[PDB]
Ligand binder design. Structure first.
Ligand code: IZ8
Ligand code: IZ8
Ligand code: IZ8
Ligand code: IZ8
Ligand code: IZ8
Ligand code: IZ8
Lengths: 55, 55, 55, 55, 55, 55, 55, 55, 55, 55
């Protein structure tokens, strides 16, 4: 076989899960957050996949 | 077989899940948030997939 | 087989779920948010798939 | 076989999971956060995959 | 076979899991955080994969 | 002060919430159920406060 | 002060929450259930407060 | 002070939370269940407070 | 002071939390369950407070 | 002071937490379970407080 990509690719066979991202956010997984009190200014309480590039 | 992509592709066979994103947000997964009190200015309480690029 | 894409594609066979996004938001998954009090100015309380690019 | 990529690629066969990211965040895994009180200004309470590049 | 990449690639066969990242965050693994009280200003309580490059 | 009860009482001062039950069911709290498919004969899918005393 | 009860009482002062139960079920708390598929005959999927006394 | 109870009592002062139960179930706490597939006959998937006295 | 109980009592002062139970189940605490697949016949997957007295 | 109990009592002063149980189950504590696959017939996967007296 032959393949040429510029990116971003994701090429496969017999594949149970696939995610391609440029951005941005993708949530595909099981996630449970239980929480009782959030205070403070300002605290990232429960972050799973996170990116902060403030300018 | 032969394939040429510019991106972003996602090419496959026999594949249970697929996500392609440029952006942007995609939520395809099970997610449960239970929460009782959020305060503060300003706190990211429960973030799963998150991207902040303020300018 | 043969395939040429410019992107963004999502090409497959025998595939249970598919999402293609450029944007933008796509919500296809099970999601439960239970919440009791949100305060503060301004706090992202419960974000699942999120993108903030304010200029 | 033959392959030429510019990146970022992810090329495979017989592959159970795949993630390609440029960004950005991708959450595909099981995650449980249970939490009772978050205070302080400002404390990253529970971070799993995290990136902070404030300027 | 032949392959030329610019990076970042991830090329394989018969491969159960794959992650490619430039960024950014990717969470694909099982993760359980149980927590009772977070205080202080400001303390990284429970960080799994973490990167802080404040300027 | 003086108090004599037979039960079931609930006596208080300065009290934000109160529930008295003999029965029976009382639902006063925030509750979110999101659900996609229920099958089987017969499975209690998502029960929060539950009592089964079949004879 | 003086108090005589037969039960079940709940006597207090300056008290934020109160529940008295004989039964029966009382749900006063924040609860989030997100769920995608329930099968089997018969499986208690997600039970929070539960009592089964079949005869 | 003086107190005589038969039970079940719960007597207090300056008390943030109170639960009295004979039964029966009481759910007053924050609870998040996220779940993707339940099978089998019959498996208690996620039980928090649970009592089974089948005869 | 003087007190005579038959049980079950719970007598206190200046007390943040109280639970009295005869039964039965009481859930007052923060709880997060994230789960991806439950199979088998029949397996207690995730039990927190649990009592099984089948006859 | 004077006290006579039959049991089960729990008598105190200046006390942050209290639990009295006859039964039965009480869950008051922070608990996080993250889980990816449960199989087998039948395996107690993750048990925190547990009692099995099958007859
Ligand atoms: C036990 C056993 C199993 C198999 C076997 C099982 C499954 C299977 N393919 N399954 C598929 C497939 C596809 C699915 C697809 S798709 O077609 O890709 O689209 C989709 C989807 S879905 O997304 O819609 O959910 C699926 N669910 C698919 C799926 O489930 C296959 C192929 C095979 C095979 C063998 C097997 N057991 N073999 C032996 C063989 C020998 C055994 C021997 S002996 O000494 O050799 O006589 C003895 C003993 S004993 O001492 O313990 O009694 C045994 N137990 C022996 C034994 O068990
Ligand atoms: C037990 C056993 C199973 C199979 C087997 C099972 C499934 C299967 N394909 N399943 C598919 C497929 C497709 C689905 C598709 S699609 O077509 O892709 O669109 C879609 C969808 S859906 O999205 O609509 O849900 C699906 N659900 C699909 C799906 O479920 C296949 C192919 C096979 C095979 C074998 C098998 N057991 N074999 C043996 C073989 C031998 C055994 C032996 S022996 O020593 O060899 O005599 C002994 C013993 S014993 O000692 O334990 O009694 C055994 N148990 C033995 C035994 O079990
Ligand atoms: C148990 C067993 C099963 C199969 C098997 C099962 C399913 C199947 N295909 N299923 C499909 C398919 C398609 C669906 C499609 S579609 O067509 O793709 O559009 C759509 C949809 S939907 O979206 O509308 O829901 C579906 N639901 C589809 C679906 O469900 C297939 C293909 C197969 C096969 C074998 C099998 N068991 N085989 C053996 C084989 C041997 C066994 C042996 S022996 O030693 O070899 O004699 C012994 C023993 S024992 O000791 O335990 O008694 C056994 N149990 C043995 C045994 O079980
Ligand atoms: C900072 C500070 C606060 C207090 C204080 C605060 C609150 C308060 N009572 N609050 C209540 C009450 C009731 C509510 C009721 S109810 O009436 O029960 O029905 C209901 C409800 S509601 O259900 O409707 O929501 C409420 N929300 C109620 C409520 O909020 C009270 C009583 C007090 C007190 C003091 C205080 N700070 N004192 C000092 C004292 C000294 C300080 C000193 S010094 O060395 O001693 O000079 C220095 C410094 S510095 O170096 O940091 O500048 C300080 N910061 C100092 C300082 O902060
Ligand atoms: C820092 C400091 C604090 C206190 C203090 C703080 C709180 C307080 N009572 N709080 C209550 C109370 C009730 C609440 C109630 S209720 O009334 O029971 O219903 C309800 C509820 S609620 O359920 O509605 O949420 C509440 N939230 C209640 C609550 O918050 C009290 C009583 C006190 C006291 C002192 C204090 N600091 N003292 C000193 C004292 C000296 C210090 C000295 S010195 O050498 O002695 O000059 C030096 C220095 S320095 O070198 O670091 O600058 C200091 N920092 C010094 C200092 O900090
Ligand atoms: C900082 C400080 C605080 C207090 C203080 C704070 C709170 C308070 N009572 N709060 C209550 C109460 C009731 C609430 C009620 S209820 O009335 O029970 O119904 C209800 C409810 S609600 O359910 O509706 O939400 C509430 N929220 C209630 C509540 O919040 C009280 C009583 C006190 C007290 C002192 C205090 N700080 N003192 C000092 C004292 C000295 C300090 C000194 S010095 O060396 O001694 O000069 C130095 C320094 S420095 O070096 O750091 O500048 C200090 N910081 C010093 C200092 O901080």
């Amino acid at each position: 076989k032959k393949g040429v990509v510029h990116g971003v690719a994701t090429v496969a066979e017999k594949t149970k899960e696939q995610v391609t991202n440029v951005g941005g956010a993708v949530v595909t997984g099981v996630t449970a957050v239980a929480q009782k009190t959030v205070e403070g200014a300002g605290s990232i309480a429960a972050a799973t996949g996170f990116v902060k590039k403030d300018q």
